[PDB]
Amino acid sequence: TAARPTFEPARGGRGKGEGDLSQLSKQYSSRDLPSHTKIKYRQTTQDAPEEVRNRDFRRELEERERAAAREKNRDRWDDDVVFKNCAKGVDDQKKDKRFVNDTLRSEFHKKFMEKYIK
């Protein structure tokens, strides 16, 4: 009826630049004014294709992998109270290292719901 889905999209090729520039209109947006009218290219130090062509990538990749693994390695009175020490060996129980692919059982969402509802 009025409220209905699509089941097919609108096709392109029949408006403002599609076949004859829509028969050469004299209407143009402010987003269609000249802007960034000069392509910047890669310089010799950046990653120009002259420099990329002779490079052996596997040796450099293995060296950077080795350096990353080496960096990760080198980084790493009232005695009469009715309840005793309840936390004996709880050394913070690393929930903040775990990452869960579930927006309802994540750690960020449990922190969210703990913070924003009292």
Binding site: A10, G15, K16, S22, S25, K26, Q27, Y28, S29, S30
Partner: protein
């Protein structure tokens, strides 16, 4: 006016030194000219070409 209405000269109208405001409003026109030429061009182009329904 503070430089103009200094001594014996009072606080009447009597002051045409329109060069400053004249420069200010012509420098307005310097930049409003592209904007209005684009806007009036699109106005005339829609009046004489018609409105493109779902073209953009």
């Amino acid at each position: 006016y503070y430089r103009f209405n200094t001594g014996p000269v009072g606080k009447g109208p009597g002051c045409g030194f329109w060069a400053a405001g004249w420069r200010v409003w012509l420098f307005f026109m310097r930049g409003i000219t592209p904007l209005l030429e684009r806007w009036l061009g699109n106005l005339l182009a829609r009046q004489f070409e018609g409105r493109h329904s779902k073209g953009v």
